[PDB]
């Protein structure tokens, strides 16, 4: 249902990154970042149900992944604490966006898979 999905992996332990906090913001008319959607990744490392086609309108979006809470519960104090990426949602473009991310204490990688 959700045209925005987030999937997070762990490069140190070779696993889905479970219980990772993900926050999505949408740029408002005044150019502030408005809270749009948020959630936590499941046991699969996937975060479903973030939003819907009705709510996910055209706009500039920021996807933030908080790595601090995640690493600490696994006994790690990371260097990279959060990572954020910004993109524009455009109705002419294909309709499902998957933001994949890979976490390590000193490294962050993300790739967008845009389908349909």
């Amino acid at each position: 249902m959700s045209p925005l999905m987030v999937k997070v992996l762990d490069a140190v332990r070779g696993s889905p990154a479970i219980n990772v906090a993900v926050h999505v913001f949408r740029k408002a008319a005044d150019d502030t970042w408005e809270p749009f959607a948020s959630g936590k990744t499941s046991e699969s490392g996937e975060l479903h149900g973030l939003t819907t086609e009705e709510e996910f309108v055209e706009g500039i979006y920021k996807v933030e992944i908080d790595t601090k809470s995640y690493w600490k519960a696994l006994g790690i104090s990371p260097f990279y604490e959060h990572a954020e990426v910004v993109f524009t949602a455009n109705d002419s473009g294909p309709r499902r966006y998957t933001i994949a991310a890979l976490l390590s204490p000193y490294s962050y990688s993300t790739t967008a898979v845009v389908t349909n």
Copy 2:
């Protein structure tokens, strides 16, 4: 001289990412992001002279790399427009931080190399 350095690479063309705008922010007491330092990468993809040991105090820092202006001048309209990473500078930790980044239209990777 600068205890913070940024180096940016291009995954599509296999080159240093030249003339990439980099902005650094430092979290203020009120928890807003204060502009701390900024610059553009050289022909080597490296950004030197960002700050000094005197100015780079302990704190939470955000490093933002704007990919839009970079890709457009190379004739590309990217999906990922900006990428940001947050870390804490701590005086007890080693004293030089190098933030390396790799750019592609739909992908972003960064790693911190912390030495001395």
Copy 3:
């Protein structure tokens, strides 16, 4: 069914990497690389049915992804032509391995997700 799965993504076009040739080798007693399994990624970028629990015994495995044929059909002549990674399968370890890969003309990234 397959305890080994391969998933491939495209960093330039932001998509599953479809029709990517994947070859798996297993190190033999004489220390040569014996052809073990191979296939092509589906429209999802995923390669299923590579092997079975009966055939996927303990051993040293190499997973090779050929990027040349893939990029050319998309009109690209890449610099990185193939990428290979080696790991040991061990029965005591968890039983499903997913090798994820991200492709660009001058860059290659892979991460293993080992579950169950």
Copy 4:
């Protein structure tokens, strides 16, 4: 002097990957991989002096990085044991190749920077 350089980083500890064994092979006329050059990364994570312009002729090259010996001495038993990438050296192309790599126990990333 060397038109081929290799630089290796560590994503777990946020450092240059020091004393990493790097092996380069060149495809022979019979299509076997002939040992071409090898070395170990310095304290900077860089491997200089691999070859020379006279020896580095046109051909298909494989760059292998052995991660097992590296991780073990740091007290880690990695999943990814080696990673290899293949490219063609072509005299018409620019003349310096830098192969950068990023290591983690379950992840490997590499990018080529081709200059001059």
